[PDB]
Design a protein around this ligand. Structure first.
Ligand SMILES: Nc1nc2c(c(=O)[nH]1)N[C@H]1C(S)=C(SSC3=C(S)[C@@H](COP(=O)(O)O)O[C@H]4Nc5nc(N)[nH]c(=O)c5N[C@@H]34)[C@@H](COP(=O)(O)O)O[C@H]1N2
Ligand SMILES: Nc1nc2c(c(=O)[nH]1)N[C@H]1C(S)=C(S)[C@@H](COP(=O)(O)O)O[C@H]1N2
Ligand SMILES: Nc1nc2c(c(=O)[nH]1)N[C@H]1C(S)=C(S)[C@@H](COP(=O)(O)O)O[C@H]1N2
Ligand code: SF4
Ligand code: SF4
Ligand code: SF4
Ligand code: SF4
Ligand code: SF4
Ligand code: SF4
Ligand code: SF4
Ligand code: SF4
Ligand SMILES: [Mg+2]
Ligand SMILES: [Mg+2]
Ligand SMILES: [W+6]
Ligand SMILES: [W+6]
Ligand SMILES: [Zn+2]
Ligand SMILES: [Zn+2]
Lengths: 652, 170, 166, 652
C-alpha cells in the first residue's frame, strides 16, 4: 500500500489526445521525496539539453507535494515544473490555495503534459474520469473569469481550476498560472502552458487519502497547531511587525509601510526615496486599503489568512497577497490606489507581478533616454498612470513594441540595442530580481542571489535572522528557545553577530559561517517544495512550527517510509544537486552565478570569491559550479556522473 | 429540564480554509485518522470568494424524500444557492451523504470526545458550541445511527435485497 | 431520463414583513377553502425581527421525527439570526409547520392544482416567485453493498446482521 | 355561529385581579358594527359623567375592528377608547401594525380594563390562557425595550406587545401606547393605562378566524388587490406626490419637502418660512434620510409599506411614519437629523408627536417673553437642540416645570397665568392641533375642525380633493372614473370648483355643498374605525379601493349579517351621534366647537355661523349641537333621548 502519496500520475500527450494513468516507483519517493524532487527526476531523464522551451518535447508538470491532502496544516502547494522560455534553465513555480489537495483527492500525484494541442483545450479531471475539452469559447478570457465560466458549464461548483489569461495564450515570457487566491507566477510556466494550447486544468476529487501511522500523524499536527497559537501570542521581540510572525509576508494586514517604501527601489529598481513615508501618504494608503480589502482569507487547511480579496470601484474582485501590493505602485512612482487597480488587470491577464512592472518601468527609461522613440509607442497617452495601462495591453497582445517587451528586460534590451543592455541592470540569469539595491555587501545574501535555482531571493531566505540585535540581551533571549536549529553553533553565531564594529558584515559572520547558514536556509525550502508544505509555516519565517527535527516524523508517519534528520538532510541534498545538474547540462556555469553589478554600493571582489569558492566546496561541487563525480556517487546520482563524463562536462 | 446544545457559527469570521472539513472526516475514518476526505465531513463550508460567501453548514437529520419545491435566497445583496442553508441529509444532493454509498451523515458533536474537533481546529474562532437548559420535554424519536443507516438502505433497495446481501457478507 | 424541479426564489431584501403570504396560504389550505385563516397553519412563515432588519420567508420542508443533536445559530453580514433560523423542517423542537391544535406536520405542495402559488400571487411587492428546470432523473446497486460494508466496519458484523432481522 | 367577530370580550378588573370572558350581544353588532362603534356603546352605559379620567371607574378598552383577522387587505387597526385626562371628553385612538389581528386569533374582540392595580403589572393572553404578571422589573423601560424583554421572559417570539414608556407611567396627558411600528398616540390613553398600573398588554393567538361567505369574501379581496395595482400604476394626475397615491402620507419615501416645510408653521405653530426649502437644505435632508432609513415596512396584510425603520448612529432602532418626521424638527427650528434623534427618545418614552413638540416650543416662547424665568429651568443648557432634550426629560419625569408642562398647553397656561393663555393659541377643546395656519377661510375644513370628535384634522379629511384643478379638462378627467362617490352630485361640485374667481372659496362650494362633503368624509372614517380597516386604503386617500359601494358587501360576506349602502350609512350615523351624545353628557356644547382665533387670517363670522347652523341641521342636532329627540328615536337611540330629558339636556 502507498501512503500520503497516491502512487499514480497522469500522462497526457496533447498532440495525440491520449491520456494514461501510470503507477509510480516507490524507490523514487525514497530518494527524492516528492513534489519538486520527483519533478526534477522526470525532467532530467526525459528533457535533454537539445529540447527548446516552445518545442513539443518540453514537459509541463503539475505536482502535488507528498503530504498535500493530509491533515498537515498549510500543506497544500502545487509545484509546476518546466524549462523556462526566458532563462532557458529549469523553472519550478509554487502555487498555494486549494488545487494540489484536490488532485490528491482525485487520486493523482502529478500531471505530466507533453506535445502541443492544435486547438485551445482544457483538461477535466473528476476522480477516475479524465477528458480533454474544447476551450475555443474561452479564448482571451482572464484566468479568474475562465474558472467561473468553466465551473458553470460542468456544473461543478466545488471544482478547482488553474488557468492562464491572455498573456499565457500569447506566450509572454513572464506569464503566470492563476487559481483563485493562488499563483504559479515566475519563470514563464504560463507561456509554456499556452504554447501547448492548454487553457486550464480543472480538477474535482472525492476519494480518501490515507496516512501510514494515524494516531502518530494527528499527534504531530496537534503539536503544530499548538505551536502556531503560542507563536501568535509571542511574536519575535523588538523586530518590525512583518518579520515577527508566521505566514507569508503579511502585507495585506496592518503595519506601517515605512521600511518598505523607503528601502525598495522605485521605478526600474532605480530610485530610493529616503523620506517618502509622510503622514499624508500614510493616511492616504490606509484609507485606500480599508476601502478595498474585503476579507483576509486562507489557503487550504491554514489559519494564517495571508491573502485578501480586493474590490476596487467598478472592477471585478480579485485576490492579492505579499509584495504584489507594492511592485506596480513603486514601478510607476504612483499611489496605492493605482497599484491595486492595475494589478487587477495583470492578474486576469496572468502576468508575473515582479517582472511585469519592471519591464514597463524599463521601457519608459529607454523612452526617456532616447533609445526608444515616441514612434515606438503609437497612441501613447500623456498621463503617467494611463501610460502603464497602455503599455500593459500592448505587452499581453504582443503588439508592436509589446512583442519585444513581452520577452523580458534581458532579451528586449538585446534586441533593441543602442546600449539598452545597460538598463537591464537588475537581472540574474536573465531573470528580473526583487527591486532592492542595498549599500553594504551582505555575504549571506550574496551567496543566495548567486546560487539559488529559483533565481528569486525571497524564496531561499528565512531561517536565519536578516539583521542582528543591538543589545546582547536580545540575542540571548532569542536563542534560548531556538529549537529549529540543526546545530547549537547557529545560536553562537547569532550571539556574536553585531550591527556595528569588528563583528559586523561583511567580515562577520565568517565565510564558513555564511556557507552553513545559506545551506540551512536553502535546505528548508527544498524540503517544503517536495512535501508541499507552505513556506509560510516552515522555511520562510523565524522559528516556524515545521523544522528539521519534526519533519522526519511527519514523513515517516505520513508516507510510511524510514526517515530521520540525517536521511532527510541527504534527501534534500540529493535532488537539490540534481536540479543543479539539470541546469549544468543546459549550459549554466560559474560565470552566470553573479549578482547585478550595482546590487551593492560596497563590493569586495576577494571576499566574494572566497565566499563562492567555499560554498561550492561545501556543496561538493568543483570551482566551475559543477557537482563532482565523487559527491554524485555518494548521493546515489551515479547516472548523473556518467552522463557528465560522456558529455565531457566532467573529466574521467 | 433537559439540555439543548447550540452551534454558534460566526460566518463573518470564516476564512474558508476548510480545516473543519479535514479534521471531522479524519476523525470519522475507520480507524480514526487513518484517512480524511472532505466529502464525508459532517460539516461542509459553502464557499464563494468572488461573492464573499463563507457559510459552514452542519449535517442534520435524514430525509428520504425531497421537498416539493426548493428554495433560493437573496439576502443582504448576496445570492445564495438552492437549499444553501438546508442541513438535511437529502437525496437531492451529495452534501451530508457518503460519496460511495449515499449513506446519511449526521453530526453528533464528536460524542464521547473532550470537545468538538471542528471547533478545536477552527483557530480563528469562527465556531463554538454552548449549552442551556429548557423546561420543554424532549419528544424526539431517538434512533441509532446504525438503524437510520440500515433503514435508509432498506428504503432505497428493498428489505429482502438488503437482508440477503447481509447474509452473504456475514 | 429527465424530471422537473421547482425553485422558490425569495428576495428577502424586498420583503416588507406584511405577512400576507401567511394569510392567503392558510386561508386557501383551509377546509372548506377560505372559510377561515390562521397564520399558524401557513406553509410559509416569515422570520420577522424589524429591529434586527430581518425579514425571511420560510417554507415548510420535510418531516423529521427527532431534533438535531446540535442546533445551529448563524451570524451573517452583521445580523444575528435565530437558532434554526433557516430550517424548513417540521421538527419536534418547535411549532412552525405543525398544526397549532394537533401537531401534525404541514407541507408546502406549491398549491397543487391552482394556476399560481397564492403566496406569490398576494405578495404585491414581488419578493416571491417560482421557476422550473429539467434535471437528470435519478439512476446503482453497488452503492448498497459499499454502504453495508461501511456499517459492518463501524458497528460490527454481528450487530448489523441481528438488526436486519427487524 | 358568529363570523368575522369572535363574539367574546375579556373583562379585567385590575383592582381585584379578576379576569372573565363574556359573550357579546349580536344585536350590538347589527347596530354599531364593531371597533369604535361598540366601544361607544360600552362607554355610554358604563361611564357616567361623574367619572374622572384617573378614577377606578374609568374604562380602558382595547378593541379589534370587525374585519381584523380576515384576509381583507390592510384590515388591522386596534381602537383604544377611554375618557381623556386632557380634554375630559371621550378619547378614541387608532393603532395599526399586528396587534389587533393577533387578538382575534386569540379569540377575543375586546379587552375592557377597569379599576387600578396597586403594583405595576402586565396582561398576558395566549389563546384561552389569560393571566396578570408582575412588571416591577420593567419600571421606567421604554415601550419598545419593554416588548423585547417581555418576549424573552415568556419565550414567545411571535407575541404582539402594546406598552407604555416612562411618560405613560407618570400619567403625562399626551402619553401614547406603542407597538413596534404602531402607535395609539393622541388623547392621553397612555396616561390612563399607566394610571391603572398597566405596563403592557401581551397577546399570542393561534385559533382560526371564520367568515360567513368564503368564496364571495375572497373575491372581494382580489378585487381590492387588483384596484391597488391599477392605482399604483395610475396616480392622481397633476397633484403633488404625497397626495397622488394610496396609504398614509408617504413621508418616509421620496418627495421634495417644499410644500410641507413652507406651509406648516415652525416653532409653536408660529413662524411661516416662505423660502426655506433651498438647494442646500434639500440635499442635506436627503443625505440624512438615505443614511437613516433602513427599510420600508408594512402593517399586517398590506403592500403599501408606509412605515420605516430608522437607525441613527449610536441609537437603538425605532419605527417612524407620517408627520412625526417633521414635527420635532419644525418645533425646534432645526434640521432633519435632530428631529430623527429626538423622536427616538420620544417614541421610547411614549409621547404624542403632535402635542409634545408644541408643548416644548410653547414653553420656550414663555421663557422668551419673560412669563417664565430661567429659575424655572435649572440646569438649562445653552444650545437650542440640547434644550429640547433637556425639557423632554423634565416633562416625562414630571420634574419641576415638567410637572406643569406634562398637562399640555391648555392646562399649563391656565396654571402659569401671567397671560400664558395667549400662547396656547392652537387648541381645540384643549387639544393641540396640527401646526397649520392658512390665509383664506376654508369652509370645508372649518366644519371639520369644529365638529370632529377625534379633534384631529388629518383623521376626518380624505375623500374629497383639498384643492381644485385650474383647467376644466383636469376635473372632467378626474370625475370620469370616480366610482367611490355616494352621489353623482359630488362630481358636479368638483367640476364647478375653481381656484380663483366667483366659483372659489370661501363662497364656493356653497354651504349645503360643504355640509354634504364633510358628512361623506367623516362617514368613511367612522366606518373604518368600526371595521378595523386602515384609512390608508379607505377614508384617507383619493379614490381608495374600499368605498361606500363595496363595503356593505364585505360586511355581509364577512360577518354574515344583512347590509347595504343605506343601512351602512345609517349604522355609521348611529354610533357617530352616540359618540356625540357621550361628549354632550360630559358637558360639550356649541361654544366649544370653535377653531383657534388665528387659524385663518381671513374670517367671515356670518358665513361661519351659517355653515355650522346648516351642518347641525343635516346631522339632526339642534342649534346648541345636541342630537334632537326625533333624530335619536329614528336612529334607535331612544334610550339616549330619555336620559337627556331626565338630565335636562333636552326639553320634554
Ligand atoms: N514551499 C514553498 N511555499 C511557498 C513559497 C516557496 O517559495 N516555497 N513562497 C511563499 C510566498 S513568499 C508567497 S507570496 S507572492 C509572489 C511571489 S512568492 C513571487 C512568485 O513566485 P512563485 O514561485 O511563482 O510562487 O512573485 C510574485 N508574483 C506574482 N504574480 C502573480 N501573477 N500573482 C501573484 O500573486 C504574485 N505574487 C508574488 C506565496 C504565494 O502563493 P501563491 O498561491 O500565489 O503561489 O507562496 C508562499 N509559499
Ligand atoms: N381606521 C383608521 N386608520 C388610520 C388612521 C385612523 O385615524 N383611523 N390614521 C392614519 C394615519 S394619518 C397614520 S400616520 C397611521 C398611523 O398608524 P399607527 O396608528 O399604527 O401609528 O394610521 C392611519 N390609519
Ligand atoms: N408618538 C407618536 N405620536 C404620533 C404619531 C406616531 O406615530 N407616534 N402619529 C402622528 C400622526 S401622523 C397621526 S394621524 C396621529 C394618529 O393618532 P392616533 O394614534 O391617536 O389615532 O398621531 C400623531 N402622533
Ligand atoms: S500561511 Fe498563508 S500563504 Fe501559507 S498556506 Fe496559510 S494562508 Fe496560504
Ligand atoms: S475552520 Fe473555521 S475559518 Fe476554516 S472554513 Fe472551517 S469554520 Fe471557516
Ligand atoms: S436539500 Fe433540504 S431544502 Fe432542499 S429539497 Fe432536500 S430537504 Fe428540501
Ligand atoms: S462537532 Fe464533530 S461530528 Fe460535528 S461537524 Fe464538528 S467534528 Fe464533525
Ligand atoms: S407577502 Fe411578500 S413582502 Fe409580505 S411578508 Fe410575505 S413575502 Fe414578505
Ligand atoms: S428545527 Fe431543524 S435545524 Fe433545528 S433541531 Fe429541528 S431539524 Fe435540526
Ligand atoms: S406555494 Fe402554496 S402551499 Fe406553498 S406556502 Fe404558498 S400558498 Fe401555501
Ligand atoms: S396603508 Fe400604510 S398604514 Fe395602512 S395598513 Fe398599509 S402599511 Fe399600514
Ligand atoms: Mg506562487
Ligand atoms: Mg396612531
Ligand atoms: W512573495
Ligand atoms: W398621520
Ligand atoms: Zn509593507
Ligand atoms: Zn414631506
Amino acid at each position: 500500500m502507498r501512503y500520503a502519496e497516491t502512487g499514480y500520475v497522469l500522462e497526457v500527450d496533447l498532440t495525440k489526445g491520449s491520456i494514461e494513468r501510470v503507477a509510480t516507483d516507490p524507490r523514487d519517493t525514497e530518494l527524492y521525496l516528492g513534489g519538486l524532487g520527483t519533478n526534477a527526476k522526470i525532467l532530467w531523464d526525459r528533457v535533454p539539453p537539445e529540447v527548446e522551451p516552445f518545442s513539443p518535447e518540453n514537459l509541463l508538470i503539475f505536482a502535488a507535494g507528498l503530504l498535500c491532502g493530509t491533515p498537515a496544516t498549510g500543506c497544500n502547494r502545487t509545484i509546476v515544473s518546466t524549462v523556462s522560455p526566458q532563462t532557458k534553465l529549469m523553472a519550478f513555480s509554487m502555487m498555494g490555495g486549494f488545487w494540489a489537495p484536490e488532485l490528491k483527492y482525485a487520486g493523482y500525484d502529478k500531471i505530466i503534459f507533453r506535445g502541443k494541442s492544435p486547438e485551445l483545450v482544457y483538461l477535466y479531471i473528476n476522480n477516475d474520469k479524465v477528458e480533454i475539452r474544447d476551450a475555443s469559447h474561452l479564448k482571451g478570457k482572464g484566468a479568474i473569469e475562465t474558472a467561473e465560466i468553466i465551473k458553470k458549464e460542468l456544473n461543478e461548483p466545488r471544482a478547482q481550476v488553474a488557468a492562464i489569461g491572455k498573456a499565457g495564450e500569447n506566450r509572454v515570457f513572464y506569464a503566470s498560472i492563476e487559481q483563485g487566491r493562488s499563483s504559479a507566477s515566475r519563470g514563464g510556466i504560463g507561456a509554456v502552458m499556452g504554447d501547448k494550447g492548454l487553457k486550464a486544468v480543472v480538477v474535482r476529487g472525492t476519494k480518501d487519502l490515507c496516512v501510514a501511522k494515524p494516531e502518530e500523524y494527528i499527534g504531530l499536527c496537534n503539536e503544530v497547531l499548538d505551536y502556531i497559537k503560542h507563536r501568535e501570542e509571542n511574536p519575535i521581540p523588538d523586530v518590525m511587525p512583518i518579520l515577527a510572525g508566521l505566514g507569508s509576508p503579511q502585507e495585506m494586514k496592518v503595519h506601517d509601510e515605512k521600511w518598505h517604501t523607503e528601502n525598495f527601489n522605485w521605478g526600474n529598481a532605480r530610485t530610493r526615496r529616503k523620506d517618502f513615508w509622510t503622514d499624508e501618504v500614510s493616511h492616504a494608503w490606509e484609507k485606500t486599503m480599508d476601502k478595498a480589502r474585503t476579507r483576509l482569507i486562507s489557503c487550504y487547511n491554514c489559519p494564517m489568512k495571508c491573502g485578501a480579496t480586493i474590490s476596487m470601484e467598478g472592477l471585478p474582485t480579485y485576490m492579492m497577497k505579499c509584495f504584489t501590493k507594492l511592485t506596480y505602485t513603486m514601478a510607476a512612482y504612483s499611489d496605492l490606489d493605482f497599484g491595486l487597480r492595475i494589478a487587477q488587470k495583470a492578474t486576469e491577464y496572468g502576468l508575473d507581478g515582479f517582472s511585469a512592472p519592471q519591464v514597463m518601468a524599463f521601457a519608459f527609461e529607454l523612452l526617456e533616454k532616447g533609445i526608444l522613440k515616441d514612434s515606438d509607442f503609437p497612441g501613447l497617452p500623456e498621463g503617467n498612470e494611463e501610460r502603464f495601462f497602455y503599455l500593459l495591453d500592448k505587452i499581453v497582445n504582443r503588439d508592436g513594441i509589446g512583442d519585444i517587451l513581452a520577452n523580458g528586460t534581458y532579451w528586449a534590451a538585446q534586441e533593441i540595442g543602442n546600449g539598452a543592455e545597460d538598463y537591464a541592470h537588475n537581472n540574474i540569469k536573465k531573470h528580473e530580481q526583487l527591486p532592492l539595491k542595498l549599500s553594504m555587501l551582505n555575504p549571506i545574501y550574496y551567496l543566495m542571489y548567486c546560487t539559488g535555482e529559483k533565481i528569486n531571493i525571497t524564496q531561499i531566505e528565512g531561517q536565519f535572522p536578516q539583521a542582528p540585535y543591538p543589545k546582547l540581551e536580545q540575542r540571548e533571549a532569542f536563542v534560548e528557545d531556538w529549537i529549529q536549529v540543526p546545530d547549537e553553533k547557529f545560536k553562537k553565531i547569532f550571539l556574536e553577530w553585531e550591527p556595528r564594529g569588528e563583528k559586523s558584515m561583511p567580515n562577520f559572520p565568517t565565510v564558513d559561517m555564511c556557507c552553513d547558514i545559506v545551506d540551512w536556509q536553502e535546505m528548508m525550502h527544498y524540503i517544503d517544495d517536495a512535501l508541499g508544505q507552505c513556506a509560510g509555516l516552515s522555511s520562510f519565517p523565524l522559528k516556524p512550527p515545521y523544522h528539521i527535527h519534526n519533519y522526519p516524523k511527519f514523513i515517516a508517519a505520513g508516507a510510511g517510509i524510514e526517515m530521520d534528520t540525517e536521511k532527510l538532510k541527504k534527501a534534500a541534498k540529493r535532488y537539490r544537486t540534481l536540479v543543479r545538474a539539470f541546469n549544468i547540462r543546459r549550459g549554466m556555469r560559474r560565470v552566470d552565478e553573479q549578482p547585478p553589478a550595482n546590487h551593492w554600493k560596497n563590493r569586495f571582489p576577494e571576499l566574494e570569491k572566497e565566499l563562492l569558492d567555499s560554498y561550492y566546496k561545501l556543496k561538493g561541487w568543483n570551482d566551475d559550479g559543477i557537482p563532482t563525480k565523487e559527491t554524485l556517487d555518494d548521493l546515489g546520482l551515479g547516472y548523473v556522473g556518467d552522463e557528465f563524463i560522456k558529455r565531457g562536462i566532467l573529466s574521467a | 429540564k433537559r439540555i439543548v446544545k447550540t452551534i454558534n457559527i460566526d460566518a463573518d469570521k470564516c476564512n474558508g480554509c476548510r480545516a473543519c472539513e479535514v479534521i471531522c472526516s479524519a476523525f470519522h475514518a475507520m480507524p480514526p485518522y487513518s484517512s480524511n476526505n472532505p466529502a464525508r465531513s459532517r460539516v461542509r463550508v459553502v464557499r464563494d470568494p468572488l461573492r464573499d460567501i463563507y457559510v459552514p453548514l452542519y449535517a442534520g437529520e435524514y430525509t428520504e424524500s425531497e421537498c416539493i419545491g426548493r428554495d433560493k435566497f437573496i439576502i443582504d445583496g448576496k445570492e445564495y444557492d438552492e437549499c444553501g442553508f438546508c442541513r438535511a441529509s437529502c437525496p437531492s444532493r451529495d452534501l451530508f451523504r457518503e460519496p460511495d454509498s449515499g449513506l446519511p451523515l449526521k453530526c453528533d458533536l464528536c460524542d464521547g470526545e473532550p470537545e468538538p474537533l471542528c471547533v478545536k481546529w477552527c483557530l480563528v474562532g469562527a465556531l463554538s458550541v454552548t449549552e442551556r437548559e429548557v423546561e420543554e420535554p424532549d419528544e424526539s424519536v431517538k434512533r441509532t445511527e446504525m438503524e437510520i443507516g440500515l433503514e435508509s438502505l432498506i428504503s432505497r433497495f428493498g428489505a429482502d435485497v438488503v437482508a440477503d446481501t447481509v447474509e452473504q457478507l456475514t
